[PDB]
Amino acid sequence: SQIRQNYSTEVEAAVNRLVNLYLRASYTYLSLGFYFDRDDVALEGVCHFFRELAEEKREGAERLLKMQNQRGGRALFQDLQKPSQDEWGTTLDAMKAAIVLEKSLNQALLDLHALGSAQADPHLCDFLESHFLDEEVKLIKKMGDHLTNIQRLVGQAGLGEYLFERLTL
Amino acid sequence: SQIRQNYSTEVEAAVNRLVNLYLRASYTYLSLGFYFDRDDVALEGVCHFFRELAEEKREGAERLLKMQNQRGGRALFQDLQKPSQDEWGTTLDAMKAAIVLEKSLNQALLDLHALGSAQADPHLCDFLESHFLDEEVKLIKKMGDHLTNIQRLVGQAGLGEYLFERLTL
Amino acid sequence: SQIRQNYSTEVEAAVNRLVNLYLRASYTYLSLGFYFDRDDVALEGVCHFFRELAEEKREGAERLLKMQNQRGGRALFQDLQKPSQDEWGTTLDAMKAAIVLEKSLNQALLDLHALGSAQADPHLCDFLESHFLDEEVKLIKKMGDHLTNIQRLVGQAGLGEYLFERLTL
Amino acid sequence: SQIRQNYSTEVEAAVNRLVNLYLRASYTYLSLGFYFDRDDVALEGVCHFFRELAEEKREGAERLLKMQNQRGGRALFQDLQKPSQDEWGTTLDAMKAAIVLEKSLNQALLDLHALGSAQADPHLCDFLESHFLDEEVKLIKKMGDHLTNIQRLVGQAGLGEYLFERLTL
C-alpha cells in the first residue's frame, strides 16, 4: 500500500478480528431485541434497548472498517457465528448476558490497545481511546445500574419486570 | 476595620463556625450523592437530590462569607472534617441522616440568631431570617414528607425504594 | 463490583487522593477569593478570578468521582485540611501561591497518569488527558502571564496593583 | 388617630428626627456632588456618585414619611442645617466624610430599631430591617472598598485620583 505507514500486520489482523466481534455482538443484540418483541414476552422497552445496542455495535464495526482502510490495511471478513442462545429468559437473564458480552468486547479493545502500544502505533491507540474505550465504560456502568435495579425489583418478579420496563426503559 | 459597626467579636466568631458547618454539610451531601451513583446502589433520583443539596449548602456558606466581609469581620477557615459515614445504606437510612444534619444546621442558625438578639445586632438577625431560617424550615418539611413516603413504601422494600426514586425524586 | 474491569486498587486509591487534592485546592481558592473581597483589600477582579477557580477545582473533583463510579471503584472521603494561609498579601503574593498550587495538582495528575500507564489502564490515561492535563497547562500559562504583568507593574506598587485588577482581570 | 395602633409617641418623634437626618444627608451629598463639578475640580465620576446618593437619601426620607402616615403618626419638619463644609478637598477627603456620614445614619437607624424593640413595635423593626439596615451595610462596604482603592492609588496623588474616577466610578 502506497499510504501504509507504521501499521503492523499484527494490528491489521487484530482489527479484522475485532470487526468480527462487533458484528457478532450486533447480531446477538438483534436476537435479544426480537425475543422481547415476542407476544409471549412483550416487553417493548427491553426490545428497544437491545435494538438500539445492535445499531451501536454495527456502527462500531463500520468505524473500525473505515479506519482499517485509512491506514492501508485490508478488511477480511469471516463467518458470523449465531448468538449463543435462541431464548433469553427474563430481563434479568438478558441484562446479565449483555454485561458479559460487553466485558468481552471491552477486553478485546484493551488487548488491541496493548498491542498498539507494544508496536508503538499511537494513531491506533488514540483511535481506540476516542471512539471505543469510554463508550464501553459508560455502557457497562449503565448495564450495571440496570442490573441492580432489576435485582432490587424481582426480589414479586412479574410485577418487578413490568415496572422496570415501564419506568426505566 | 473602617466600616465595622455594631458587629461583636462573638458574632464574627460564630459566623466563621457556621461557615465550617455549612461546608461540612455540603461535603456530607457530596458523599451521599455519589454513594447513590454507585453501580451496586443505582438510584439516580436520590443521587440528584443530595447533589442539589450539596450545592445549596455551599451557596449558604458563600452567602455567610460575603456577609462577614460586608460587616467588616474576618473570615477564618478551619479543617473540614469528613462525612460521618462512608456508606449510607438505604434511601430511608440516608434521608434520616439528612434530617438529622439539617436539624443540627437549623439549631446552629437559631443559636446564632439568639446571640445576635443578645448583642442587639438587628442586621444579623434580619440576614438569618431572610436567607436561612425559612429555607431550613421548608427543607426539613420536605425531608419529613419524603421520610413518611419512604416508610409507607418499604413496609416489599426493594420495590418500594425503586418506586419512590422513580415517582417522587 | 460486577462492572469493574482492568481497574487496579492502586489507581482507585490514587483517584481518591486526587479528589482530596482538588477539593483542598477549591477550598484554598475560596479563601483567596474572599480575602480580596475584604474592605481593606478591595480588589474585586482578583476576588472573581479566584472564586472562578474554586468552582473549576470543585468540578474537577466531581468529574473524578463520577469516573471512579463508572469504573466500579469506591469513593472514600478524608478530612479536608484548611488552606495554608489566612491572609494572602498582595496580588503578586497570591498569584505566586496559586501557581505553586496548580503545579502541585499538575504533578499529581502526571503521577496518576504514570501509574495508569504502569498498570496498562488506557481508559484512565485517556480520561486524564482529555479533561485535566491540557486544562492545567493552559491555566498555568495564564497564571505565568499574570505573574509577569503584575511584576512589571509593581516595580509604584499600589498603582500597579489597581491597574492590573482594572485592566486585566 | 382612628388608625393608630401600637405606635408610641417616642417612636413617632424619633421617626421625625430620622427624617431630618436623611434630608440633611441628602443636602450634604448635593453639596459634595456639585463641588466635584467645579471647573477647578472636574471629577465627573465623583460628582455622579454623590448626586446618586443625594437622591437615595431623599427617597429614604420619603419612605419614612410614608410610613409615619401609615402608622397614624404626624410628620413634623424642622430646619435643615447646611452641610458641614463648603469645600470637600480631594476624593479621599470626600469619601472619608461620606463614610462618617453614613455611619452616623446607620447608628440612628440602629438606635431607632432598639427603641422599637423596647416598645415591642415589630412593624417598625421589620420596616427598618427591610428597607434601611441592609442598604446602609452594603453602602458602607462599598465606600470602604472605594476608600481602600483611593488610598492605594494616592500613595502620585493627581494621577491616582484621575485613574480612580475614570476606571472605578
XYZ file of C-alpha atoms in Angstrom, chain B residues 22 29 49 53 57 95-110 132-148:
38
model
C -22.292 24.585 56.070
C -24.214 15.682 50.701
C -31.465 15.071 45.319
C -28.378 19.901 48.406
C -25.140 24.262 51.391
C -32.981 10.527 54.447
C -32.887 10.023 58.237
C -29.224 11.047 58.303
C -30.057 14.092 56.143
C -32.886 15.221 58.504
C -30.517 14.871 61.473
C -27.972 17.007 59.607
C -30.434 19.752 58.658
C -31.791 19.951 62.214
C -28.264 20.474 63.533
C -27.776 23.275 60.973
C -31.133 24.777 61.964
C -30.153 24.696 65.648
C -26.880 26.455 64.815
C -28.858 29.103 62.907
C -31.214 29.560 65.863
C -31.643 30.814 56.038
C -34.384 30.242 58.621
C -37.281 29.822 56.196
C -35.189 27.761 53.780
C -34.276 25.347 56.594
C -37.887 25.001 57.723
C -39.093 24.285 54.154
C -36.264 21.792 53.538
C -36.911 19.906 56.779
C -40.648 19.683 55.965
C -39.800 18.238 52.536
C -37.427 15.671 54.056
C -40.076 14.765 56.626
C -42.577 14.294 53.778
C -40.067 12.090 51.929
C -39.308 10.077 55.064
C -43.007 9.348 55.580
